[PDB]
Structure formats: C-alpha cells, structure tokens
Chain A
C-alpha cells in the first residue's frame, strides 16, 4: 500500500522542510484517481526564499515511467513555466530507478537546466516519516561559516571529513545539497552520545 503511505508522508515531508503548500489538498481517493487517469500527481510547495518545489508522484503502471518520450516532454513542458523553480522531485517506483532510458532523460534535463535541482526518488523514501525512525540519528545541516570555523580549528579540509550522499534519506528530508555539511548527533554505547560532521556528496542517480 505504497500510495496510501505516500499520500500522507509526502505532505509530512513538505512540512519537514518548512515549505508552504500552494494548492489545497484533495482526498486520497481523488489522488488515486488522478494518478490512474493522468499518470501522475503534482504537489507544489513554497520555500522561504520564494523558490518553488514541485513534486511529481508517478504511478507504477503509468506511461511516463515506461516510454522515455513522455517523461521527456513532461519535464520539458514543466521546466519552461513561469515559476521560480528550484527543485523538481520525481517519485517513481523502485524498478523505474533501474530503467536506463528514464535516467537518461533525467540527466539530459539536468544538463539542459544547470540551475535547477532534478532528483528522482523511489517510493519508500516518502512512505514513512524518516526523521522519526528510531534507527536514524539526529541529522542537522550546518552553515558554511560554522563548518569553516570547525575545519580551521581542526586543520582540516572538507575532503578529509566523512562524506554522505545527497540521496541519503535523512539528507533528502533535510534538503542537503552537495557541498553542504551535516552534523549528526548519534547514540553511543561508550560515551552515551557523539557528534560527527559529514560532507554531502553527489546523489547516486
């Protein structure tokens, strides 16, 4: 029942990044009807810096995840709209992540749009509240100045720190971009807790 979990935790995810919803919510039945009829559902959110984040939830049996041409035209038509876009989130079924053609359209759109963050994610990333999962430590993005002060005290470069992918689920929920620093407060059975700082690297897809 991935759709039912998504319908709630995608809005929980929008809330967790401190984003303002633009379009009013619809019932879950209407969400399923739109996904089956259109082939996708769209959720638009407002960021503090007035950026727009658009989330596309694609059906597992939709056309956009099977034929690369439909995804290509959809992305091209959504990426030339009069909106202050900053990120498009394309939530597709896990098998779609292994479909090479879809990823090729994704990377082609990335190349054609250098200032827009394009990410494609599986369903399970938004079928739960990732930060509230017990096994996941407390992640927190830190500023560049604070990280530079830490590195200067430690005589370190950002390339010496432990590194974390930008597609890591807690980093995704934080909104971590490559080149950012994430401080992780994690439990310890030797000191009762510990703090590490990780350098965010490029997403795997």
Chain B
C-alpha cells in the first residue's frame, strides 16, 4: 500500500472518485417496449 498507487489507473483516485461518481437517488432496470408511450415519455 502506497500513497501514489491510489492515483493512476481506471480504479484509481482520479478516474473513479473525481471524474466519475457514485450517486444517490438513482434507479436501474431492464428496458422494455411499450407502443402506447410517446417518444418523450418513459414508463
């Protein structure tokens, strides 16, 4: 374990914590077809 190994890679500090972010108030699910919804609507 070192201080400067926290930085470099995709799982590092810069790319995982600063350039991206874990967030609250978000949802995920499989998407599905529905022909009764308008193009600007989501079920």
Q: Are chains A and B touching directly in their complex (CB below 8 angstroms)?
A: no
List chain A positions with a Cβ less than 8 A from chain B: none
